[PDB]
Amino acid sequence: MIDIHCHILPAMDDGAGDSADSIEMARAAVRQGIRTIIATPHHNNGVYKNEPAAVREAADQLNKRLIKEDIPLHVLPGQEIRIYGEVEQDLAKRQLLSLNDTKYILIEFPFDHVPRYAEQLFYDLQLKGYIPVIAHPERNREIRENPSLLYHLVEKGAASQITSGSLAGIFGKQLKAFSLRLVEANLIHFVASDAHNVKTRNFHTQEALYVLEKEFGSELPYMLTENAELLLRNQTIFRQPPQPVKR
Numbered sequence: 001m002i003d004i005h006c007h008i009l010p011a012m013d014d015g016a017g018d019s020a021d022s023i024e025m026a027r028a029a030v031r032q033g034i035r036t037i038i039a040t041p042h043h044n045n046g047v048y049k050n051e052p053a054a055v056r057e058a059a060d061q062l063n064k065r066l067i068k069e070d071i072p073l074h075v076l077p078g079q080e081i082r083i084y085g086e087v088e089q090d091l092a093k094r095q096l097l098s099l100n101d102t103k104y105i106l107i108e109f110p111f112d113h114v115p116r117y118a119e120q121l122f123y124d125l126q127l128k129g130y131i132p133v134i135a136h137p138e139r140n141r142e143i144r145e146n147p148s149l150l151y152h153l154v155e156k157g158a159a160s161q162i163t164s165g166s167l168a169g170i171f172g173k174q175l176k177a178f179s180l181r182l183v184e185a186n187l188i189h190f191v192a193s194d195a196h197n198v199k200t201r202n203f204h205t206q207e208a209l210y211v212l213e214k215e216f217g218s219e220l221p222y223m224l225t226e227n228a229e230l231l232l233r234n235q236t237i238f239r240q241p242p243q244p245v246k247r
């Protein structure tokens with residue numbers, strides 16, 4: 001399996017602190033059946049930027065260490081990009097990374113609202129042949145209050161990625177209930193760890209898949225999982241008709 005959102009690169013962000021942490025996360029990933037991780041460090045971390053060159057370097061260095069440690073995991077480059085006005089321009093200047101250099105780009109809304117220009121940005125990116133992937137829409141306060149916002153963005157061509165932990169319940173009962181609503185409505189296209197460490201914000205990959213299998217049957221989690229394989233290959237992901245969700 002492929003994990004498309006993960007903070008396994010050390011000293012970049014709020015995920016692994018150092019390379020020893022990265023290695024522990026990698027071992028956990030492997031135990032969960034993950035063979036390939038797209039590292040998605042935040043493009044900004046405080047006062048610092050994690051430029052594309054530095055991300056590629058860090059992924060290359062982590063891969064060398066994983067080989068040294070005999071861990072069967074391959075880390076590919078990417079970024080988690082908090083939305084801002086100049087995403088389309090900065091991408092064209094190669095000052096941002098898409099996921100594994102594919103057409104899929106991981107865009108995160110601030111936790112409290114969906115910026116008003118989001119739809120316009122996403123339209124612009126599609127016209128350039130990108131597919132914006134909304135990070136953890138279930139963790140957004142405004143989508144939670146008004147899920148129709150996600151429905152519309154997805155109807156208009158956006159994809160989204162749910163967090164394994166949300167489905168697994170490790171972030172609470174409420175997040176799980178909401179996540180199942182989004183999945184049912186065909187508004188989710190990927191499941192990913194968003195792992196930051198081994199103990200609290202960890203993978204919960206199999207746990208999430210089991211929840212999906214129990215709730216929807218075997219074919220749905222297969223579809224979500226294969227979507228990560230399609231993404232990796234820069235193929236077009238599979239979608240079901242999006243549906244409004246209420247409340």
Ligand SMILES: [Fe+3]
Pocket residue numbers: 080108135136
């Ligand atoms: Fe995030």
Ligand SMILES: [Fe+3]
Pocket residue numbers: 005006007080194
């Ligand atoms: Fe993240």
